Symmetry: C3
Subunit: 161 residues, 3 copies
């Protein structure tokens, strides 16, 4: 039972032309709209969490932190990540590595990726070499391209201890 | 050559407002429309199969079970899964673990996941701990959100014997 | 640090009704439009590259080959792949296996997959058994289904040397 694979996927619709400014990978990114979600609305962490729990066959964030429950209204996605990893460790697994892809027309994710990596390496208690983050656009096609929300895909490897 | 990775992806358009009621992960889920496909139309099994065959570098379900061939009109996706695994075993591989994500606005996948896991653990001849299933919506965005079909992504790890 | 996982994702919008004819997985496929990209516009290689670099926590193709830089206007995606792998080897990793899924309504990818596999096995310097390629459509749904562009997802396993 040496190694386990996991996959995550999250999308959030953009809000009004208010503020937010969208938080992603625990980083506050200036933008003229934020994302609409029951929680912090951080698609990168949501997708990373789902990957982790999925690898551990623990379901997903829903299965750990009921979406219905008012205790998680606006809750910090970094907190959820951190709890999820505590459970994974409990079960005798440890992060191998993590690869994330943000899918967004705008804003540019590039400048914020180093800090995102810092946050995750901190949260999954590991060296920053086990964390990789990418962005791409869909060349203006589909709802991400039409500019309506952003999406995120994650892929994870867990190692036995 | 210790371990091999695989990825799958399937989508089916919804039919009329007839019946179906859609079958997914081998589970019959009540819903006012079913999916339109040449076979059973089970996106979770289709995507899981593709992942498995992909990891084994065996192509995909097309390469094993010609879509053109009338012998697979309405064929049980569980049967196809089962044959595909027989071939994978033949080649000296065995499931490590499987993680699936269903992408759908409605109906709720939650209540049916335990049974889906039972079906796969049965079919891939393994303990149910090596099988993980998740759902998410795309927050009403895109064709899954517009309610037009459902999509499924799968990720697999094969181990050498 | 035995094995590392990676994920890639690319999409390109179709051009006019001119020529192109679209190049994918290094194969020239007859079609009445080609893809619109700053480079060769080969979504299969782009996604494969991103997976590789992602597994190596090296960022993505952007981080190696600035999109802004005029030296990569129309550049061969096979060249980029090849350079990326040189860097991965430099860091003590080697391909385990690769699985790719092309997502397209038309044209049919089927007949070209053997040759695509030849190109990659050549480029990643390995036996063709470590390379798997698939296509699917989205049953005419979404922008791939509406026929507006094609998309590609890749998944990779790197082994330590």
């Amino acid at each position: 039972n040496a190694m386990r694979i996991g996959h995550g996927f999250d999308v959030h619709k953009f809000g009004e032309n208010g503020s937010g400014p969208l938080i992603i990978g625990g980083v506050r990114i200036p933008y003229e709209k934020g994302l609409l979600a029951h929680s912090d609305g951080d698609v990168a962490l949501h997708a990373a969490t789902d990957a982790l729990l999925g690898a551990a066959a623990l379901g997903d964030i829903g299965k750990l932190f009921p979406d219905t429950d008012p205790a998680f209204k606006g809750a910090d996605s970094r907190g959820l990540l951190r709890e999820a990893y505590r459970r994974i460790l409990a079960k005798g697994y440890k992060l191998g590595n993590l690869d994330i892809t943000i899918i967004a027309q705008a804003p540019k994710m590039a400048p914020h990726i180093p800090q995102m990596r810092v946050n995750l390496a901190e949260d999954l208690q590991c060296h920053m070499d086990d964390i990789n983050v990418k962005a791409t656009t869909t060349e203006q096609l589909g709802f991400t391209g039409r500019g309506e929300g952003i999406a995120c895909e994650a892929v994870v490897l867990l190692v036995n201890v």
